[PDB]
Enzyme design. Structure first.
Site, PDB file in Angstrom:
ATOM      1  N   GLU A   1       0.830  -1.197   0.000  1.00 33.62           N
ATOM      2  CA  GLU A   1       0.000   0.000   0.000  1.00 33.62           C
ATOM      3  C   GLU A   1       0.863   1.245   0.000  1.00 33.62           C
ATOM      4  OE1 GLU A   1      -2.320  -0.813   3.607  1.00 33.62           O
ATOM      5  OE2 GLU A   1      -4.165  -0.985   2.409  1.00 33.62           O
TER       6      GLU A   1
ATOM      7  N   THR B   1       0.251   5.883  -0.913  1.00 29.35           N
ATOM      8  CA  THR B   1      -0.682   6.997  -1.003  1.00 29.35           C
ATOM      9  C   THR B   1      -1.637   6.832  -2.204  1.00 29.35           C
ATOM     10  OG1 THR B   1      -0.885   9.388  -0.953  1.00 29.35           O
ATOM     11  CG2 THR B   1       1.074   8.479  -2.107  1.00 29.35           C
TER      12      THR B   1
ATOM     13  N   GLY C   1      -3.036   4.140  -3.313  1.00 29.40           N
ATOM     14  CA  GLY C   1      -3.985   3.061  -3.092  1.00 29.40           C
ATOM     15  C   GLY C   1      -3.275   1.783  -2.697  1.00 29.40           C
ATOM     16  N   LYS C   2      -3.620   0.683  -3.354  1.00 34.18           N
ATOM     17  CA  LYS C   2      -3.188  -0.662  -2.989  1.00 34.18           C
ATOM     18  C   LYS C   2      -2.602  -1.504  -4.143  1.00 34.18           C
ATOM     19  CE  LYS C   2      -6.743  -3.522  -1.500  1.00 34.18           C
ATOM     20  NZ  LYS C   2      -7.573  -4.340  -0.565  1.00 34.18           N
ATOM     21  N   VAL C   3      -1.773  -2.512  -3.790  1.00 38.79           N
ATOM     22  CA  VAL C   3      -1.221  -3.464  -4.751  1.00 38.79           C
ATOM     23  C   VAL C   3      -1.612  -4.838  -4.219  1.00 38.79           C
ATOM     24  CG1 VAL C   3       0.756  -4.251  -6.142  1.00 38.79           C
ATOM     25  CG2 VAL C   3       0.668  -1.860  -5.372  1.00 38.79           C
TER      26      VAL C   3
ATOM     27  N   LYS D   1      -1.980  -3.140  -9.253  1.00 34.04           N
ATOM     28  CA  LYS D   1      -1.922  -1.851  -8.592  1.00 34.04           C
ATOM     29  C   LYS D   1      -3.301  -1.206  -8.819  1.00 34.04           C
ATOM     30  CE  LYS D   1       0.915   2.400  -8.669  1.00 34.04           C
ATOM     31  NZ  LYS D   1       2.119   2.994  -9.299  1.00 34.04           N
TER      32      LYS D   1
ATOM     33  N   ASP E   1      11.745   9.503  -8.511  1.00 30.42           N
ATOM     34  CA  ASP E   1      11.260   8.995  -7.223  1.00 30.42           C
ATOM     35  C   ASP E   1      11.910   7.650  -6.881  1.00 30.42           C
ATOM     36  OD1 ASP E   1       9.584   9.013  -4.803  1.00 30.42           O
ATOM     37  OD2 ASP E   1       7.964   7.988  -5.900  1.00 30.42           O
TER      38      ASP E   1
HETATM   39  C1  LIG Z   1       4.811  -0.077  -1.124  1.00 30.59           C
HETATM   40  C2  LIG Z   1       3.907   0.578  -2.128  1.00 30.59           C
HETATM   41  O1  LIG Z   1       3.752  -0.256  -3.324  1.00 30.59           O
HETATM   42  C3  LIG Z   1       3.792  -1.518  -3.694  1.00 30.59           C
HETATM   43  O2  LIG Z   1       3.320  -2.327  -2.972  1.00 30.59           O
HETATM   44  C4  LIG Z   1       4.138  -2.258  -5.043  1.00 30.59           C
HETATM   45  C5  LIG Z   1       4.490  -1.616  -6.230  1.00 30.59           C
HETATM   46  C6  LIG Z   1       4.703  -0.363  -6.596  1.00 30.59           C
HETATM   47  C7  LIG Z   1       4.161   0.575  -7.484  1.00 30.59           C
HETATM   48  N1  LIG Z   1       4.046   1.442  -7.999  1.00 30.59           N
HETATM   49  C8  LIG Z   1       5.800   0.162  -5.999  1.00 30.59           C
HETATM   50  N2  LIG Z   1       6.700  -0.166  -5.164  1.00 30.59           N
HETATM   51  C9  LIG Z   1       4.695  -2.567  -7.238  1.00 30.59           C
HETATM   52  C10 LIG Z   1       5.039  -2.481  -8.609  1.00 30.59           C
HETATM   53  C11 LIG Z   1       5.144  -3.682  -9.369  1.00 30.59           C
HETATM   54  C12 LIG Z   1       4.921  -4.996  -8.770  1.00 30.59           C
HETATM   55 CL1  LIG Z   1       5.082  -6.367  -9.700  1.00 30.59          CL
HETATM   56  C13 LIG Z   1       4.597  -5.103  -7.449  1.00 30.59           C
HETATM   57 CL2  LIG Z   1       4.399  -6.704  -6.739  1.00 30.59          CL
HETATM   58  C14 LIG Z   1       4.463  -3.921  -6.638  1.00 30.59           C
HETATM   59  N3  LIG Z   1       4.153  -3.738  -5.381  1.00 30.59           N
HETATM   60  C15 LIG Z   1       3.819  -4.921  -4.509  1.00 30.59           C
END
Ligand SMILES: CCOC(=O)c1c(/C(C#N)=C\N)c2ccc(Cl)c(Cl)c2n1C
Ligand SMILES: [Cl-]
Ligand SMILES: [Cl-]
Length: 348
Positions: A30, A32, A34-36, A52, A149
């Site tokens: 997660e 700002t 939203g969620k993954v 995402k 970033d």
């Molecule tokens: C910590 C905030 O974001 C994420 O969790 C995130 C993010 C993101 C975004 N944007 C950033 N770290 C991911 C991008 C690609 C893939 Cl494959 C995965 Cl598994 C991602 N995850 C699990």
């Protein structure tokens, strides 16, 4: 049927589906935005994907439309998929929520560090991640793009499976990642050379002095961010643990030396200076924090051996105040520090 919370987050849990295709099987992170979530793609033999799901808020939806456009341009450039960037599989607007499907990767480098109780990565792990960051970012830079970033949270292991090893010297267990292959994530802020450059970029701790001093920025922004990251991987704590500009500049001074007088004379941000020198209250809570905790970069070396000296030399060159003097990634890939890489690591 489709529900959003007060902040515009899509109410979704394990066992929920999107587009009668993606089935949510777990939560990966997660932010700002939203969620993954982890999904099984029912149109792709239950292929495991990372989806995402962006907040149903105007600012986030626009930032995601910008990221999608960046990932498409990257996809056009890296056909072979050899330039270490997250691989976008699909994208869609789901009831105001932008959704970006990616090839499933492991934990981000901050989350692995957090779960290893901030115990740092060993120098060989730091070396291979640096080499890959330098290579991945050199490609995007060669394509007239700047990430802006870069931070540990935005770097992912291809696979985060680890071996639990008992550190004899610390008398505790440590999680050692089996595979140090990584990918760069989060192109929501990525800017092309000919596009509008916002005055302020980067997450604070990874922000370069030219952005603080509003001297404009380009590709060298990312080199500073990498220097900060390598330090955090090496020691396990942030180099600039700040929430404020004035304190930020004081830290940079204590750790790296004086701010070049050319940058002081050029900046329109004169409030930070008095008589050509940085101005600050040494007796405030920030003044005392900095004076006690911020030491010259060299002092943070854990070992005296050749490979540690070279990491610090490369990091120092990544943290040159003047963006024009900062080492380029093309030069970074040539640094003697990378001679310690195994042939499997060097070749990719
Ligand atoms: C910590 C905030 O974001 C994420 O969790 C995130 C993010 C993101 C975004 N944007 C950033 N770290 C991911 C991008 C690609 C893939 Cl494959 C995965 Cl598994 C991602 N995850 C699990
Ligand atoms: Cl501009
Ligand atoms: Cl902040």
């Amino acid at each position: 049927s489709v529900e959003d919370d007060k902040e515009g987050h899509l109410v979704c849990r394990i066992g929920d589906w999107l587009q009668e295709r993606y089935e949510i099987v777990g939560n990966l992170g997660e932010g700002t935005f939203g969620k993954v979530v982890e999904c099984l793609d029912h149109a792709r033999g239950k292929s495991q994907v990372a989806l995402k799901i962006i907040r149903n808020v105007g600012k986030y939806r626009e930032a995601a439309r910008l990221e999608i456009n960046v990932l498409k341009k990257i996809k056009e450039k890296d056909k072979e998929n050899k330039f270490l960037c997250v691989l976008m599989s699909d994208w869609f607007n789901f009831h105001g929520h932008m959704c970006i499907a990616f090839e499933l990767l492991g934990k981000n480098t901050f989350e692995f560090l957090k779960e290893n109780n901030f115990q740092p990565y060993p120098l060989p792990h730091v070396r291979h991640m640096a080499y890959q960051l330098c290579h991945a970012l050199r490609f995007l830079h060669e394509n007239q793009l700047t990430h802006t970033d870069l931070k540990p949270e935005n770097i992912l292991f291809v696979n985060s499976e680890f071996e639990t090893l008992y550190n004899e010297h610390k008398s505790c267990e440590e999680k050692s990642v089996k595979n140090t292959s990584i990918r760069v994530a989060d192109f929501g802020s990525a800017t092309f050379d000919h596009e509008h450059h916002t005055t302020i970029v980067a997450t604070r701790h990874y922000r370069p002095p030219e952005v603080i001093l509003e001297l404009g920025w380009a590709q060298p922004c990312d080199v500073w961010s990498i220097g900060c990251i390598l330090f955090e991987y090496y020691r396990g704590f942030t180099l600039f643990q700040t929430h404020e500009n004035r304190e930020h500049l004081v830290m940079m001074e204590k750790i790296l030396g004086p701010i070049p007088s050319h940058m002081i004379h050029r900046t329109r941000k004169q409030k930070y200076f008095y008589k050509g020198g940085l101005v600050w209250d040494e007796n405030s809570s920030d003044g005392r924090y900095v004076k006690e905790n911020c030491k010259p970069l060299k002092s943070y070396m854990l070992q005296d051996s050749l490979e540690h000296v070279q990491l610090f030399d490369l990091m120092r060159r990544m943290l040159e105040f003047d963006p024009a003097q900062r080492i380029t990634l093309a030069e970074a890939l040539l640094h003697p520090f990378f001679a310690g890489l195994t042939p499997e690591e060097r070749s990719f």
